[PDB]
């Protein structure tokens, strides 16, 4: 019937403070309105001047702050009908206040099958910390701990290779500066 839109962040969903971010929404051709919803409230609207000629919209933030970090969804209009919301976009503002320390247990590079547990400290932060594997399969691993958080990996494998980074958080969407790589 009315296809579900796709929302994404350019360059990436991890936007350091006062950096530019463009949220893109791909709806359908001949759609009259395109809405960006921020944390359950209308944030922005794009009305494609030639509507039949357009299937996508660009929303851009010029200076990224904490005030605009959070959950984004996209919705578009055809007549008086509204498409069901797009996937959720979690816009995270990085480089907020401090740099956390990233230690590794037992060592920086080890023999396979060894139990590896990454550690990340930063007082003056929340109990939530994030572990990130740079590049190839850039997934985020969430960790809990007062002042120091434990990121167990267990028996290491060849995929467990890579340069890792740690972020502390001031809320789920406002993370600290990245920690020195491992």
């Amino acid at each position, epitope marked *: 019937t009315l296809p579900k839109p796709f929302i994404w962040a350019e360059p990436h969903f991890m936007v350091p*403070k*006062e950096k530019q971010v463009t949220i893109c929404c791909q709806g359908n051709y001949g759609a009259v309105e395109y809405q960006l919803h921020f944390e359950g409230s209308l944030f922005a609207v794009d009305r494609p001047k030639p509507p039949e000629r357009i299937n996508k919209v660009k929303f851009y933030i010029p200076d990224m*702050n*904490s005030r605009m970090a959070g959950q984004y969804s996209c919705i578009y209009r055809v007549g008086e009908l509204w498409s069901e919301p797009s996937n959720l976009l979690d816009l995270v503002v990085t480089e*907020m*206040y401090d*740099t956390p320390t990233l230690s590794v247990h037992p060592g920086p590079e080890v023999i396979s099958g060894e139990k590896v547990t990454f550690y990340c400290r930063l007082d*003056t932060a929340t109990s939530m910390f994030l572990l990130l594997k740079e590049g190839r399969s850039s997934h985020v691993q969430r960790g809990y701990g007062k002042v120091q958080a434990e990121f167990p990996l267990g028996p290491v494998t060849t995929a467990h290779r890579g340069t890792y980074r740690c972020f502390g958080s001031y809320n789920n969407h406002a993370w*600290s500066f990245p920690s020195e790589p491992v």
Partner: antibody
Amino acid sequence: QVQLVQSGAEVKKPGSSVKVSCKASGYTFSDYVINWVRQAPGQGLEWMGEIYPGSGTNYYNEKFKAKATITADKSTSTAYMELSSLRSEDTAVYYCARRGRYGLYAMDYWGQGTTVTVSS
Amino acid sequence: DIQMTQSPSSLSASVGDRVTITCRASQDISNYLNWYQQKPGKAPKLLIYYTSRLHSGVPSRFSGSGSGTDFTFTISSLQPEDIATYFCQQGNTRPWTFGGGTKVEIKR
């Protein structure tokens, strides 16, 4: 661009309290820690405390924990320092300095100072 | 509360001279050291952050070296404007502490 405008200098009769302000502009106030640094004649630079504006989280120097009251007002984008029970000894130049540009705890941008004078 | 000891209190050098300020911490502060230039009347300006890093605007001639407890600030070739009181500060543990400050003058 980035500015830190402080309130006018004051004469304070001993016993009185002072509220010195620091209005932030050219940046989003809440994404930068506001520090309050004192400079008594000869005593050099002494760090009094700091506020994380975004969550109102405070960190004081025990020495100044007594009379200093660091508060941040997101709604006006101004950081305040209240100095209660003013003693002659407290007469100094008061600075406000931001601390988030490099997550390495450096005061990149400083206010102009407020020359507070405790005197009868 | 880490104690920063700056040296010398003051120094006078001719224009185009290499100037070296010393800074010592009571505890190992890693590289969490900053340097400020304070001109007469004005507020301190950030010169060097994280021991060796140059803040946006600060000229090439300024530099910083060190690790642990022993740290130094250098000017490659002293300029008449570089006349000010320099301060080092630690950012390792709270409270942030500053060095007593070392003044700089120009011999002419």
